[PDB]
Design a protein around this ligand. Sequence first.
Ligand SMILES: Nc1ncnc2c1ncn2[C@@H]1O[C@H](COP(=O)(O)OP(=O)(O)O)[C@@H](O)[C@H]1O
Ligand SMILES: Nc1ncnc2c1ncn2[C@@H]1O[C@H](COP(=O)(O)OP(=O)(O)O)[C@@H](O)[C@H]1O
Ligand SMILES: Nc1ncnc2c1ncn2[C@@H]1O[C@H](COP(=O)(O)OP(=O)(O)O)[C@@H](O)[C@H]1O
Ligand SMILES: [Mg+2]
Ligand SMILES: [Mg+2]
Ligand SMILES: [Mg+2]
Lengths: 525, 317, 55, 526, 538
Amino acid sequence: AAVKTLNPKAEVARAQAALAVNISAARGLQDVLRTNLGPKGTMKMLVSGAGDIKLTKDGNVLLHEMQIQHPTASLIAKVATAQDDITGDGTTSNVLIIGELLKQADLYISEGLHPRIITEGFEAAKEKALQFLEEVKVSREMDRETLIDVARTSLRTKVHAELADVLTEAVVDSILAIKKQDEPIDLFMIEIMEMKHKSETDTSLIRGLVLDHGARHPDMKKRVEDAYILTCNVSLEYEKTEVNSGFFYKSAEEREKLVKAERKFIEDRVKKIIELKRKVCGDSDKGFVVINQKGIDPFSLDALSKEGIVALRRAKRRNMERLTLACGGVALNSFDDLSPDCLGHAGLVYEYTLGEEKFTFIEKCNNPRSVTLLIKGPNKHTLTQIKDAVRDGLRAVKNAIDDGCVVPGAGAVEVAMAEALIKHKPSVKGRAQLGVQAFADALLIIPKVLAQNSGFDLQETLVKIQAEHSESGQLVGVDLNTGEPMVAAEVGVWDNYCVKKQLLHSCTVIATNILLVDEIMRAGM
Amino acid sequence: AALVIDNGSGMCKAGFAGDDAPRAVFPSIKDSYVGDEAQSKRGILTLKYPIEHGIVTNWDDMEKIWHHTFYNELRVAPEEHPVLLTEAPLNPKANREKMTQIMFETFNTPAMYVAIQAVLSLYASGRTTGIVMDSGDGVTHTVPIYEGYALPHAILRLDLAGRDLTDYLMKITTTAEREIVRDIKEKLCYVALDFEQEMATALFQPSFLGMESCGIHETTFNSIMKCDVDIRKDLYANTVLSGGTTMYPGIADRMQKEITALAPSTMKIKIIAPPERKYSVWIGGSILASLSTFQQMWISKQEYDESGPSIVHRKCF
Amino acid sequence: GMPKRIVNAKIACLDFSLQKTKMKLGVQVVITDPEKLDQIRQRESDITKERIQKI
Amino acid sequence: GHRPVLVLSQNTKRESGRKVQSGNINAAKTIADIIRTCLGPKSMMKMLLDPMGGIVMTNDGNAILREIQVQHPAAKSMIEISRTQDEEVGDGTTSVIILAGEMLSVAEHFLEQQMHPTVVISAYRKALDDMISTLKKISIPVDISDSDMMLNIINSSITTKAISRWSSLACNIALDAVKMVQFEENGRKEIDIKKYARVEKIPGGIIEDSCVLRGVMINKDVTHPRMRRYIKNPRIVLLDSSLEYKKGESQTDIEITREEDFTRILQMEEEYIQQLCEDIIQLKPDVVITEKGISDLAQHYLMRANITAIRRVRKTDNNRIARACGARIVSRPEELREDDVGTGAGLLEIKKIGDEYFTFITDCKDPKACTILLRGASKEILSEVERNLQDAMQVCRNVLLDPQLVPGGGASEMAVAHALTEKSKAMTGVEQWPYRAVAQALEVIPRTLIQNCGASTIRLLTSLRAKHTQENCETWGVNGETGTLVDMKELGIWEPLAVKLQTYKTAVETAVLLLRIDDIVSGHKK
Amino acid sequence: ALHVPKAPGFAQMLKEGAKHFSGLEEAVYRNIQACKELAQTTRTAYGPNGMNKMVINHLEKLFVTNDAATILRELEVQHPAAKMIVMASHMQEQEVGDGTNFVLVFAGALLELAEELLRIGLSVSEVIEGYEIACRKAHEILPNLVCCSAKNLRDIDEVSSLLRTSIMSKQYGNEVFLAKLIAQACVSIFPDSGHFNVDNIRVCKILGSGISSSSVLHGMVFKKETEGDVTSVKDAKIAVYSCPFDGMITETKGTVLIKTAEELMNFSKGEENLMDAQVKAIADTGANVVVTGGKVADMALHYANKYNIMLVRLNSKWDLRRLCKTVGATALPRLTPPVLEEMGHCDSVYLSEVGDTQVVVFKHEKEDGAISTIVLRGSTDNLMDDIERAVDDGVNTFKVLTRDKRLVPGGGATEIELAKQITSYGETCPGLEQYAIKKFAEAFEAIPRALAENSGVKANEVISKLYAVHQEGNKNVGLDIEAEVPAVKDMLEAGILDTYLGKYWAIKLATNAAVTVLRVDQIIMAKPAGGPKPPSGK
Ligand SMILES: Nc1ncnc2c1ncn2[C@@H]1O[C@H](COP(=O)(O)OP(=O)(O)O)[C@@H](O)[C@H]1O
Ligand SMILES: Nc1ncnc2c1ncn2[C@@H]1O[C@H](COP(=O)(O)OP(=O)(O)O)[C@@H](O)[C@H]1O
Ligand SMILES: Nc1ncnc2c1ncn2[C@@H]1O[C@H](COP(=O)(O)OP(=O)(O)O)[C@@H](O)[C@H]1O
Ligand SMILES: [Mg+2]
Ligand SMILES: [Mg+2]
Ligand SMILES: [Mg+2]
């Protein structure tokens, strides 16, 4: 060929062969991910080269963990990664719709049709589908019940049903706490701490904070009832001078004086803390907890323990904000002019030892604008799975709140959009109508696979559902327990409008760009 | 890919994972065209190399260097490639926090990892367990490594490097003439199994130089004896030497003999010190960055944003 | 931030660098009264400033 | 033994003669055939695989040729001229390759027929000069104040690219960006769309929400969460200096013998940071942006003044923030003046896009810098959108500098080829044949357009070559979407005269270069 | 036509050394087979008649034990499903301390029976439904099977009788001696507060005198020697310092700047006079014993000898913390004399030679303290490690009894009653769940089956007898180890009892592990790494 005469070690796939490559890879991905879709899907186990185990049903995780070296698979994995980074859910469905668009386009390109016409039909169908989506979207006041149904629709796909019923309340309560009226939800204000000791259904929402470390001085209390929290970012350990000072003495007595003096700088900050503590709690009734983003040497730990202060050091840069929003103080980088108004309050602070590590709970805050999800479970992979599930659920509830609209689920919107595309087809000029048909049969992959996963006949279920939607018009989807049509909005099966829109847009775009590929080429050597 | 910047108290020796040689040896590495393709480099050419004795003195310099070892001698972008930097053994935590703040905040690197130069040297030799004797220009280090990680508790640090070595030879003053003594140090300086039979036809012993701490063989022996008694066999039998200092005299067998003497009469000690690829640390870094366990060890950008200097310090205080 | 066109160009050709002043090899700063350190650091830059002002 | 007594080093291979000529010409026309199908509006994408595991899905001639590797020096030269075209005008990077390939192809004829390469070269130079004359003759001016005319000019440049589906959107972006980057100081006009028009690709979202900001955007958050993240009239200060306490350049070694000296020294460090922060607060800013670090004590002092700081920004981002908010970067807060403070920004926001915090300095008035925020399905799609937008912006710039237009659809190629054929009838020497062959070699652009449209080259080219023999038909060309001849005044495909002039010059000069070449040599070390 | 090509799609795009298993045949049955192999590997160690195993790990270290969790840790289990069952067993070891072998046996049995049910035609989903509902029934049932409770954990005869069962499976021959020792140790600890810390039970393994020479010591033992000339003290007034026993030095850098011959002449004398003052202040507080966590200086040691102070050097920081808890002292970061509260006290501190080993003993006379030590004598390090594991089992049982004082009958009695009751529950449940419920019930039979098989008798005769006697109404009946023939007896009247919490958590974790293994349908193994192991686990 052309490239192989100049770079002999070049790999090239031309026109039809290139199409053959790309579509084949897409269909391969679909075959892997088809089983991930829905609550009746199957969990895959993924073993790293080190031997670490992952139990997952998540499309993005599955992609990045499968062992694949294909360029089309790389493209589709990146599209799914963007879907996950922006919406948190929709990756499996993204891959499925991409694969099905490519397959339905191969249906007509094998018949000698040019991919350009299919892509024109794709663009027309995208427009009409986005219109029908905005029309059918359900604008709803996001109440705890609506958000609970949303989070259920996500967690029931990602985890077991009882654990999903737990994570639902956990996630919805978590978001409804860190949420400020008409102010985008900062999910950073939900810490996510995992503990590896108890059952997975013990995963809870602490209306406060859980630090993965505790006090390093033993004489420090392990439980504090009415606590003043001092969130600081001030070094309380020995800091050497920037200018390489060095000490010079002529006598052991002078050496002793210099040893006592070299710590005066940090002794002064410890003294400031101790004076604040004494001035704010003159008795032993209340407690005082210092949480430092920086270090605290053993001398400072002793000095603070002697006065009855619980000092934790080298906390996380995000815990500064989480503590100032949960407890309610001010985070400090200096103790120059500190006042009791710089302190937060916690109605309980205590310590929990788990094997070799320590955790510190800060609870009974007044109205914490930051909370934590304590992911308890008996196994590392259980914890990872629950983390992925709660990420999905948090993104789902956040998106349902941000986008006050919510879309019916169980493939209902896909069925209805397919019918609408099929009714719209004649209005398209030329043979791009065939691309529209392909788009419809691509949209129809969501209910089909759901049936495929619940153990039903794709064709029979899909005809039943489309018939029910044409006779009634009720947005209906798959009942995974009977295989019959069901009204998703009535049974509480909700999807995110943002997710469906992102699916349509990104899937159409990547499928168009793949269909217009006519040469794959590796010639960089 | 993954950029593997090997500082190694040498030059930048930067490149990509998979390359058998670095592509960006900046310190001591066109014109008449149009543009700023020489002036921008002419600025760096006369800039002092920050790392001295295996420790970063001037950070602004180092940052400017890295920036010029990314945009000019690699013509790439760090915002999409993970970086593997290297640090000297027993490197202060503060330097780690500084370089991690530079990479994640300035260069906005998606993920990075800091590896010990001796561990990467051992990697380039193909092994994952053993005790590395790294003696360069300013420092001497014994790093016991088991399962591929430098045990942070048995790192014995003594100081008898090229400088300290050529010192006594100078004794036997002016820059040029002490560099004649150092030229002889650079050339053949065969290690003596026994100085008796070596001077007859004419570091191991502190008294020789004038120190009063320990020999390098004593150092290795005690670094092996501060580890697990089961891995003791592997430490004793996989001692890997590195450093141009230790290469110049080619010391293998004198060490081997006196280490055997110190050790029990059980473990057989074999020292592999013939490589001299002159890029061992770089190749070890490339191997690591090529592996998937490097993705496992990634300090990610999100991790950095969430933890700061704590993520750089890996908690466990 | 510098302009990129000048009309009545008065040109100064210098064969030395305009950088923060560093004491040469045989000169050391040794503080025994911290109150002087600031002023010393300040000269390290003010020296160069004065040269540029003269130009 | 008797070691080889050679004159040249072993491995030194020397070719010579018509084999070298034919080899160079075949390598060139192979480079051409690689991207021949990537020309016009009905082109198809190519997915190239980088050595770094990356992927590049594109239609751009220079992208493709830059991603492939060759060893033949003629192919090297063709890739280099594609790079030249991309750097100079930023469009036509594949038209140039095709034209150069065809010129070399037609010169192969005359070389096989005992003509000397210098004769062919002199003819090529005559033909190039006359092309220049004809282009400058048929060009028309443009009123750059007509935003719609400019949007049509930019559409005629992106119609051949993937963003064509959001063509109008992309057109506005490019136009807006360029109109903001136009800057004049001391009588020097500057459209520097490489340092001051920045493209930030954030995967996710939808492309239709991508926009050009009246300001800049960086990937940054406040240094301390007590700092504001939303400021509606920010006074902004830019710094090249660290707000930390760093060492001196000399050997500033200290010597302590008294007790109070250590504490006094550490408090002196704190006082230095205090004095820097006070020198800054005296200007009463709302936002402070540094290229270097900011110590936590400095953060405390700035926050006390209710100031928001962003710690470690790039010098390029700092320069764009300067141009956008109207500030002047300083390096010594003691030397800070009101003229160096940045007024002009209308809003500073720090918002969460996905799981990242992005700093916008938007709502600026008269910002001489901009950030094009691209949103889309994936890094690959957005890299392609960025390259297409580079094409659009480079075209807008070429227009604003030289407002002359020429017709597209191959109309210009046929008009100039006809003019050259008509002038050739006065030529009586032996160069008339290569000259007319270059005229027939310009025809390849419409040929390629027709081929990529899927139409009949013979019939259409015949009708078009005939149309261009009439009087007022120098604007007639072909559609790359239907395969019919049209008037460009009726279609609207008009390219910048500068683009096509540079195209023709690069093509003809590359042909001259490869024709002069003979006698390849190889082997010798550097 | 001589090669089958990889099918288009995932089969071709898969990497070189990666593996993909899918479906009941390639994945589910292979996982169940692996877990069955695991259960078989550890089955013969279950119970008092369980035999020891000699596992040699990759470092050629030898473990001789019948402790399931130890064997699993020291085995290199590489199959992922078996890895998951081992993860469950280790969670059992962490939560309770005993019952890991129950977890393995029960999980392996549940998975074998799940394979059977899948073969007869049930779906993994229905098997999981039945297993979970049956686990819920087992947890509903177990509280009713509780027969005894501790009723006192400050006693030593009751506590010994209670720990005997946990320390019988391990170290069957000698279980009264060890239970006495562990009861003595556990009750010296366990203050008036309901909190009991297992790290406060220290075990010192010294070699050479048989296990019957083991002893309890209300105090601490350190295989150290004394730094100075004093070796015994009868009214210890211990002063504990985290700092070395040397002059404090600067954190920045220290240089002795001499400018006059007089300063040079006086520096060293000033140093020693300073050291003399420091140690004399310490001695004058009454301290006769000093314990430093850092190094000792020659001059400071000189003056400690002069003023008759016993010096002890503890390299570890945990050893120092535990000594502080023992003696009631406070580790001072300065060499300042201790205040009356910062000082610790001991009825004796002395250097002794237990066997070949020299030891420093901080011994209280009172039958209490914050820390107690068990000095294990023995002719073999491996034997002493096995006895230490038995001690750990007994101590974790004591803690479980501090948490929950309820006890169920052992020797398979609880398992047989559970099997019977869950079978009676499954016989009532209609639908496809009854098969899985009855298999979950029959899985309990694996425990008395393993006990019988290991005792050396016919498991079928034993299980038939147990079913017959439990039908007559006796829920406390289990099998008799003291019988050459299949026999059974009252576990309660014999005193063979297990912990309600032990069984609760073992059933919960085993059921969760089996159900997790079953939920897997596709496995996508990656090519094995040469990576320098997990970074976090070091
Ligand atoms: N209870 C349910 N019944 C029917 N369909 C459901 C139910 N829950 C979720 N779905 C549908 O299953 C599909 C896939 O779910 P999920 O796997 O979470 O999405 P993704 O495939 O993006 O990960 C969604 O389109 C959702 O509407
Ligand atoms: N709609 C159209 N119909 C016909 N020709 C067109 C059309 N749009 C652009 N062209 C022509 O296509 C050529 C541009 O090709 P393009 O694919 O952009 O490659 P290049 O990088 O060489 O510009 C120009 O000659 C232009 O006149
Ligand atoms: N004297 C005994 N007679 C019968 N069974 C016993 C006796 N002592 C212990 N057992 C049984 O042995 C089993 C525990 O033995 P062990 O090997 O330690 O397993 P685990 O590690 O699960 O505790 C329990 O079923 C317990 O009832
Ligand atoms: Mg989902
Ligand atoms: Mg163009
Ligand atoms: Mg037991």
